[PDB]
Design a protein around this nucleic acid. Structure first.
Ligand SMILES: [Cl-]
Length: 411
DNA sequence: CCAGTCCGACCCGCATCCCGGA
DNA sequence: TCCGGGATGCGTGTCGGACTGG
């Protein structure tokens, strides 16, 4: 019935069981997902026939409640379920059975990358972009520069049963990279089985889109390689980066004859100009950039997507200009009503860019106030500068795109 | 009083499943 | 059978804001 779903029904509201993660500062945090039943600015009971038939001018509103160990308590701007989906088909979800599976999805998703997950640890993420905090060189040992490969990141560890567990940055297990997993098992017969190996799934001269497809697919072509750049034990996380790289180096001397598993090569540096000279080298060899790691930096897992300040990536930030043609709007929660641009290419294929340095207070206005009559007089045809990481190799659309501003500025 | 977290949305691209119509 | 739409959930990531730890 309705109790298919975990949680408690009270006060016209069904909130799911709290999931509780620990903040980096050691404290306990709680997070609540809840659903309501608004009709004409009012709250209504919870039936078992809103899962069967829709009530007129009745929408379900899903909101989130997050709070610390009793500090301030947020409520999120409601996300309005106006309709169901697949309504003509045999999978027609009414607007409440759908809101209750939309919220239940967020329950299963939100568990990962927290402090639990089969014993997986989220990999460490870098903080600084084209910045090397000068404290990296003010230590007893020099930092390390290695290349950065435009691929999908994966962590390998051996579970108790002896099988190989290869998971992603959000703690999702990769499937069917059997060739890599095969030489991972052979390798684990010679090393401390409690070790984690941190690297990038990658195959040189292949786009990121192709590498991403091979990883997330159940079946696989078994051509990818695994380039390990770091290792750690769940026990000793404070082990400085310089030490971890030295054990990893001898891990790969326990077997120097593999096809799909290779250790990322390490370079020691004493100034910024050495790193950039290596960074320039890496991009001409075809790679994405360079990674700099503080010598005495611990391993800080990416819980709640936390980015460690002991790492930096040096990578070209690409800018170009694209013809503005139209405007649009977000669709869920806080972005409901926020402006988004629509650019267009020579080939005349269109895409969306989120503006930058614009308050949500602004973006609500520039969507409500703008009119096709007004827009056309002032903004249509102008050139929008877009920052991006790379061009879509199959459409030329800039991916990871941001709108910094125009060439002929406006308001 | 901040710098530091953490959240809650989002681009495009890809993989898969379930759907019915051909 | 194949060929879609529609929906979902991955990946590389993005940024604003609302908090909070020191
Ligand atoms: Cl390398």
């Amino acid at each position: 019935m309705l109790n298919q779903f975990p949680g408690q029904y009270s006060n016209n509201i069904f909130c799911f069981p709290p999931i509780e993660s620990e903040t980096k500062s050691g404290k306990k945090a709680s997070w609540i997902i809840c659903v309501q039943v608004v009709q004409h600015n009012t709250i209504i009971p919870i039936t078992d026939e809103m899962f069967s038939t829709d009530v007129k001018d009745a929408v379900a509103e899903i909101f989130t409640k997050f709070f610390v160990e009793e500090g301030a308590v947020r409520i999120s701007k409601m996300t309005r379920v106006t309709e169901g989906k697949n309504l003509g088909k045999k999978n027609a979800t009414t607007v409440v059975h759908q809101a209750f599976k939309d919220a239940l999805s967020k329950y299963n998703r939100h568990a990962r990358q927290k402090r639990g997950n089969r014993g997986m640890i989220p990999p460490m993420l870098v903080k600084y972009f084209n910045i090397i905090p000068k404290t990296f060189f003010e230590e007893e040992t020099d930092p390390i520069v290695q290349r950065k490969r435009n691929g999908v990141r994966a962590v390998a560890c051996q579970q108790g049963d002896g099988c190989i567990l290869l998971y992603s940055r959000t703690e999702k297990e990769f499937l069917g990279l059997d060739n890599i997993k095969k030489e991972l098992k052979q390798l684990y017969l010679f090393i401390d089985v409690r070790v984690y190996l941190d690297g990038e799934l990658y195959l040189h001269r292949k786009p990121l889109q192709w590498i991403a497809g091979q990883a997330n697919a159940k079946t696989d072509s078994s051509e990818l390689h695994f380039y390990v750049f770091d290792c750690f034990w769940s026990d000793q996380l404070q082990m400085p980066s310089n030490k971890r790289q030295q054990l990893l180096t001898n891990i790969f001397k326990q077997k120097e004859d593999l096809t799909f598993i290779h250790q990322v090569e390490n370079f020691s540096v004493k100034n910024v100009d050495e790193a950039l000279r290596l960074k320039a080298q890496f991009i001409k060899e075809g790679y994405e950039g360079a990674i700099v790691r503080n010598a005495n930096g611990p391993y800080e897992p990416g819980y709640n997507n936390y980015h460690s300040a002991h790492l930096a990536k040096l990578k070209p930030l690409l800018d170009a200009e694209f013809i503005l043609v139209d405007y649009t709007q977000g669709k869920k929660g806080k972005d409901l009503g926020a402006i988004l641009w629509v650019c267009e290419l020579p080939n005349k294929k269109r895409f969306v860019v989120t503006p930058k340095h614009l308050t949500y207070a602004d973006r609500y206005a520039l969507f409500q106030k703008l009119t096709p009559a007004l827009f056309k007089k002032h903004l249509y045809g102008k050139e929008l500068t877009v920052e991006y990481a790379e061009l879509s190799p199959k459409t030329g659309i800039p991916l990871q795109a941001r709108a910094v501003g125009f060439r002929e500025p406006i308001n």
